[PDB]
Design a protein around this ligand. Sequence first.
Ligand code: CL
Ligand code: CL
Length: 162
Amino acid sequence: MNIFEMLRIDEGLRLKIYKDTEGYYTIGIGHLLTKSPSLNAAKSELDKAIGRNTNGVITKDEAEKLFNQDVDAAVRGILRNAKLKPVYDSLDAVRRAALINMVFQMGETGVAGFTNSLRMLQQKRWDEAAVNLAKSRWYNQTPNRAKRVITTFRTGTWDAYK
Ligand SMILES: [Cl-]
Ligand SMILES: [Cl-]
């Protein structure tokens, strides 16, 4: 298990434009295209992202290319953020993947707002952090996925993804 296999489980793989759990146009392995309700706007974002005039359909290789870029972008966002970087640096590689997962789903600014959970993670108060993380819109709207990520923070193992 690693961050790519983890997010592939959590996000799935779809080669045609679909709506994510929030209703937003998405493709591939959780590649958000736009929050606009216009399918045409989403297709324009897709064509720009891929470099060709699709029409809402991509290949598996193309989906994996976006995925690699999106995982990169999550890590780079963590490292450039003054709240997220110290927490990330303080973690083991398994829990680092859990934080990347959160940033992939919600964005750098969103995760950086979890001030109290971030402090508990920095303090390595794993059970307390897990309780605090679940007190969130995140957990309520995607509870099975959040439970997997929270278990990863709590245990530092991949048990929730086996
Ligand atoms: Cl993008
Ligand atoms: Cl879920």
